[PDB]
Every structure is written in structure tokens, then in C-alpha cells.
Symmetry: C3
């Protein structure tokens, strides 16, 4: 809490006056981003409260990734569709191993029996294998030479069935109230206003300090949007059952996969530019690996001191690879 | 039963006179195919009875996919080796998720505890991972630039060890009798005679209504040959233990993988044209995904109302992708 | 024991005088290699004794693959970096399925309940998925067009974190003594002296009897270095719990993945030539398959008469594919 208050209150004016100064561009992005972490850290706490207060699963789904959903909206109008696609990548990579890895590792003070074996396999994996592997992989391979008109039609079908299933499944499946109200202005508008700045910022930082443009989306942009907002997980270690921690990471990721991207892909239509679900091989091999890692660890659990270390390593390895490109 | 009687009795004369009329080609294929569904629906019931009556596992293996084995024989003489390879693809895709997906979904009236956990993992997965991943994937990657003479030699080795293992493993591992007799004439000859028509038909439908040639093999042709014959599975929901239903789908698929294709690959030798086990990337990524899906779901079970919905979605997604190519 | 004594005592003088004769080259490699099998069979027994006598896990890690580590050192100075990379491949392929496959199959006299279910999943798979899939796959995809300077930097990072984790994890995690002493001279010097011969030998056998150069590394070279040394596993069937047998195969392989290669990659720096972790697609698809196979079988166990047969088949299939290239 303490640190986060400082960053919201210091970040917004600096970001505002920074937008008024207009230069230098490189330092301000740096400032722009920093605020949003904290802004998403609140965004996350505000949703968690509302979800605790059936259909609140929509709020957890939409507004729980609203900073992901939002930074990617205006990147879509000014799209820059590439950044959108790189950022969706980063969302899955971010929860795994990063949020999950940080959770497992930090709360590796003392090992906690063996849980939750009967739950995870049945629900988490299937869609997770199903969602990612179907959703993203199929588009990539099939779209090689189709070409364009076919690409988006496939995406539309996939996207539409993903939501139509997600809604079909979901719908059939501390200190609250004040936070549920204050979120929108403190975040959803400030985040949306700082957003407008971010895209214009990127080309310039990409030309001045590279590389690369894709890296920005994949590591930095995701760190801010998804990780920070979902960082709730790490905190709930030992003090409460890490049951919820794996739920938060994978449930959120599933939602990215089955909801964020598909809706966002839909959105791409109403503006002239169109994003089909096309990923780079380095992006896709990275995603399926994380499913495999998650799956490997998820078998018995509950967690180990280096259950997280293994994960964090894998993620930081992928980050440095993504930077080198 | 009721519907199937209508389609056999109406389909065969139409198909015969259609073969006599010789035109238009497009409509008749359409008619040709329709009959065979029903013809394979009987083909399947006739084998199931015989299997119920040790070595009856050969009958279940051979004649249980005889319509797959058969439509692909004359496509091999007139091969058109491509269609053969696309159809083998469709067989695995068809059982998964389609037959398995339809079974799981339809019998999702009320959930049935958690089964069969100790059986499935040990037997179904290993060969399934082993069979598909080894059988098909290895050929594809290794065959990139070998070239030709090497391709088939690898296939021969793989094919031969697959049978030699399958026979080695298998051999060491209602209303009957009348159906066991009537099958051959009612089906194996009629199916074989309608077959002769099918191949000649495809180029024309492929040139008039496309696309594509591969699609025909992958979705339509498989629907008819394998799915229909194996559709037994869907029916046995709730009324009987779905134990057999997962057995039918995966056992059949394993047999395709370890038997149908390998024998069929062997056959390719005695005619001049030769098919090595070469698949397109879109075909192969689709197959391994289905193993992964099957594996994901297979962990605990027993099944969910949307255990099937997830599957059916994935399959229909792959079908529309395969059509777009 | 009996056979191995004959091969050490006959192999070394022949190899020495062979090195003095200098011709013909093809037959001597053949002789060179044969000795080393036996030399590594001792190398293995000498380490197993020392390990039985905390930090002895380093000896098991280093000297347990010292013939792999060593044949690849001088191939690195004279590198020929390709052979190094093909040989690391062969190490994982060798343990799986070959050592593991031979163990499972040979001790398939009578099936031994269902073990060891709770152990294997938690530890063996995660790193195994993590180690191989991260370690090797990531480098391959990401390194496509980086190019060179980036390649090795990624490798360095990966390599360094792999050891830094492996040491971090490991360190936190019959007839002895005389063998622990005699090993070095009988093997580590003789093996090192026969090594000097091996590399110079390969081009010539590769030009006279091909193919291919990669094959040499992938099948032959690995058979000798890793399999022979680790062949301890096969022997401990029934007489003792096959607990250790799966431990030997996978623990060794994990060590290859997390230690052998990374250290060896490091070594590549001090000489002018540099090996980044770059694999061919046929090499990599082969490795991940073996993880998948291992994983598939590892689910319940304990083993079946043809649990090994399935494996041995897959391996021999990969060997013939690797030869055809």
C-alpha cells in the first residue's frame, strides 16, 4: 500500500505536465509506464473487491484486464496491430511464470503439503491447452499462405466461438464498495489518458533506444498492464491458501486467451486496420512452453522453494531472448 | 436404426443409377457420400458384434476402418496419394474430438463421478503420444530434404515396426451372427463400388466447388469413413459405462495410427506411385493438438457438460481452417 | 564384468598401436569406439561407488558424463562445434528411451505393481520439461535471425542460469574405494588419449563411409559416451527397486541438459570458435518427443513388458531417420 500511494500521487502530475512539456520523449514513457503499474495495482484491488461483492465474473474478466484491454484499444486505432499481438503474448507469459513464479517462489518459506491435485488438472489444463493451443497456434500455422481475407475470417470464427463458449461456460459455471466506485476515475480515465501518450511514445523510444518494437509489447507493456494488476497473487502466500493464487494466475490467463484477445480481435474490425490472430514463431513457442511448464508443475504441487525459481528463470530467459530480437 | 435403413435403401439405387447417368458430377458425389455414412454405420455395428463374438481384435482393427482402408485403396491406385494422407489425418481428428467430443457432450445430462483415472493414463496416452508423435511427426521433419528414396525407406521402417509392434502387443494383450454375415455384401461390396466413383468425382468437385482438394480428404471424406463407422460411441452414454466410449475412440485412433496408415503405406509400394508418411504442417499441428487435448481432458474425467463443447469447438475450428486453405 | 575386462585389455593396445600404424583410418575408429564403451562402463561404475561413498552429486554430475564432456572438449578445440551439438542431442535421446527403454524392457519378466507415482511427476518432469524445452528449444527458435553475437549471448545467459540454478538446487537438495582411485588412469587418461584420435578420425569415415557427420555425433558417439556409462540402470531390474533406474536415466539427462551442455557452451568461449545452443529441427523435434514419451509413460508406471518395446522402437526409428539425413 505505502509504496503504491506514492507512485499514483507522484506519477499522474508528472505524466500530465510531461504531456504538456512534450519532451524529451524517452524519459516520459519511462515515467508514463511507472505510474500505470501502480494504477493497475489499484485497478486489480478494485476488481477483486467487486468480485467478492456470478456476473461479477464479467468484471473480473473485463476490468481485471482493462489496462491490457485499454492500452491495446488505442494501439488498435493507431495500430500498430503488432504491439497489440505482442502484448497478448506478454499477458500469458506474465501470469505464468512471472506472477505464478513470483508467488510460488516468495511463499517458499516452508512447503505446504501437496495441493490442489484433483481441482487443477480437470479445469485449468484442458481449456489452457485448449484455449492457447487452439486459439493461437491454429491461426499461426493455418494462416501461413491463405491469405489476408481468409486470415481474419478464421480469427473471427475462433474469436467468436471462444467468447460464445467462454460466456456459455462462465455464465453456467476486504474493504469493499468505496474502491469499486473510485477505481474508474483514479484509474480507468487516468490510465486511458496516459494510454493516449504511450503509443505515440513507442516509435520514438524504439528508434532512439532499441531493440525492439516487439520487445516493448512483449515484456515492458505486459509487465505494466497484466502483471501489476494481477500481482494480488504473490501477496496471498501462506497467510491464505495458495489455492486462489493459482486460480488468479491461470483464470486471468484463460480469460486473456478466451476473452481479451478475441474481443480485441473483434474490435479491430470497426476501425479500418485489421488484426488476425497472427504470432511470430518466437512468440508462440514461448507461449506453449509456459503451458507445458505450468502443466508440469501443476501435476502434484503444492509448491517448492525453487518451484518458482525454475519458473522465474524460464521467464527471464524468454525476456532476454525477446530483447535480443 | 430407423433413419439408417432409409439411407441405405435410398442411397444405393440412386448411387447406382447416378453412376449410370454420369451427370451432373457434383450432386452425385453429394449423394455418393451420404449413402456411405449409413453404409459405415452398419459396417461399424457388424464389426462390434463380431468383436463381441482375441483375434476378433484384428476384425475390429481392419474392418472397423475398412471404409477408411477401402476409399484410400483405390485413391492409392488412382492416387492421388495426397487424399490418402489427408484422410489418415481426418481419422485421428475425427475420433477425437468429434466422436469423443460428441460422446462427452451429448451424455452431459448429469456428470458421472470421476473415471477412469488409473486405466487411461497408462495405456491410452503412451502409444497415443508414441504412435502419432513418433509415427507422423518424425517422418514430416526428417523428410524435409532427404530426399525421395530416403523418405519411403523411413516410412517403411516406421510402418513395419508399427505393425510388428501392434501385432506383437495386440496378440499378446447385441443381435450377432446375421450382421457378421450380411456386412460384406450390404457394405464391403457396395462401399467398394461407390468408392470407384468417389475418386473420379473429387477433381471435378474440387474444380467446380472449391476449396480445397485437401479439405475433401480431411473433413468430408473422414466424416464418412471413420466417424460414421465409429459413431457407436456417442450412443453408449449413461445407459452404459462411458468406459467403452473412450476405448472406442482412442483404440480406433491408435489402430489408424499404428495399423491403417502403415499397412496402407506398405500397399503404396505394389502400385507404381509411392506415399511416404508426409504431412502438411497445418495437418500435423492439428493432430498433436488433439493428442494434447485428449491428454488434458483424460487426466481425471469422467466428463463435463462442456468437456465435449470445448472439444467440438476445437474440431469445428480446425475444419473451418482446413476449408480456408 | 567378464566381457568388459576383455574389451578394456584388448581395446587399449590395439588403439595405441592403431594410433602408431595410422592406417587404415576407418577400421580403427571402429576399434577406437569399441574400447570406449567398456572404458565408460568402468567410468560409470567408478562414479556410482564414489556417489555411494551431498557434493558427491558433483562427481555424479561431472565425471558421470566425463566421457561425454571429454570427447566434446577436443571436438571443441578442433570443433567441429556441430559434432558437439549433435552429441548433446544424443545424450538425452540415449538415456531416454534407450537406457530407460532397455531397462523397462529387459526387466519385463513380471510386472511390478504401480510405482513411483508421487515422486516422478513433481521433480522429474518439471525441470525435464523446463530444462530441455527451455534450454534447447528457446535458443533454436529465437536464434533464427539475430544473428551471431546475439546467439551466444543468449546461450551464455541460459547456460549461466542453468548452472546457477542447478548448483543452487543440487547444493540445497558395492566394492568401493579402489575403483574411485583406479578410474582416472584406466579411463580418464586412456579415454582422453583415444579421444584425440576420434575427431581426426571422423571426417575420413564421413567422407569414405557416410552418412552423415551429424549421424556420427547423434547415434554412434552418444551410444559410447553416455549410454555405456549409464548402462548401470538396465542391470538393476527386479533384483532392486527400479526406482533408481528411472532416477539414473532422467537425473543424468537433466544433468546433461542443465550442466554438461551449459558448461561446455561456456568452454567454447576460451577457444576462438564459439558454439551457441543451436540445433537442427530434426534434432529438436526428436528431443521434445522423448520428453513427451518419458512423460506419457511416467504417469503411473511402474512398467510393462512392452513399456520398453514402445520406447526402443521410437529410438531405433529416430536412429534410422538420423542416418538417412
Amino acid at each position: 500500500n505505502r509504496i503504491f500511494f506514492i507512485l499514483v500521487a507522484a506519477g499522474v502530475p508528472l505524466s500530465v505536465i510531461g504531456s504538456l512539456m512534450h519532451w524529451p520523449s524517452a524519459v516520459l514513457f519511462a515515467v508514463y509506464c511507472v505510474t500505470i503499474i501502480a494504477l493497475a495495482s489499484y485497478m486489480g484491488r478494485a476488481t477483486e473487491s467487486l468480485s467478492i461483492i456470478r456476473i461479477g465474473g464479467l468484471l473480473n474478466a473485463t476490468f481485471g484486464n482493462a489496462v491490457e484491454l485499454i492500452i491495446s484499444m488505442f494501439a488498435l486505432k493507431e495500430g500498430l496491430t503488432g504491439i497489440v499481438l505482442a502484448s497478448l503474448t506478454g499477458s500469458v507469459l506474465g501470469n505464468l511464470l512471472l506472477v505464478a513464479g513470483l508467488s510460488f517462489f516468495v511463499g517458499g518459506l516452508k512447503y505446504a503439503r501437496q495441493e490442489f491435485n484433483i481441482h487443477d488438472a480437470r479445469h485449468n489444463s484442458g481449456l489452457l491447452i485448449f484455449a492457447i493451443i487452439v486459439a493461437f497456434v491454429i491461426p499461426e500455422v493455418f494462416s501461413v499462405g491463405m491469405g489476408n481475407a481468409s486470415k481474419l475470417n478464421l480469427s473471427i470464427g475462433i474469436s467468436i466461438i471462444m467468447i460464445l463458449l467462454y460466456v456459455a461456460a462462465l455464465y453456467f459455471k476486504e474493504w469493499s464498495g468505496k474502491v469499486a466506485t473510485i477505481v474508474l476515475f483514479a484509474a480507468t480515465i487516468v490510465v486511458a489518458y496516459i494510454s493516449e501518450n504511450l503509443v505515440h511514445t513507442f516509435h520514438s523510444v524504439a528508434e532512439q533506444f532499441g531493440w525492439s518494437e516487439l520487445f516493448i509489447g512483449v515484456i515492458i507493456v505486459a509487465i505494466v498492464g497484466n502483471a501489476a494488476e494481477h500481482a494480488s497473487a504473490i501477496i496471498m502466500a501462506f497467510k491464505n491458501k495458495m489455492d486462489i493464487a493459482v486460480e488468479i494466475a491461470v483464470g486471468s490467463t484463460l480469460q486473456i486467451a478466451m476473452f481479451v484477445a478475441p474481443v480485441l480481435v473483434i474490435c479491430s474490425i470497426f476501425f479500418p486496420t485489421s488484426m488476425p490472430l497472427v504470432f511470430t514463431l518466437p512468440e508462440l513457442v514461448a507461449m506453449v512452453s509456459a503451458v507445458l511448464l505450468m502443466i508440469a508443475i501443476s501435476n502434484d504441487g503444492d509448491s517448492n522453494w525453487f518451484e518458482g525459481a525454475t519458473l522465474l528463470a524460464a521467464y527471464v530467459i524468454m525476456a532476454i531472448g525477446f530483447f535480443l530480437l
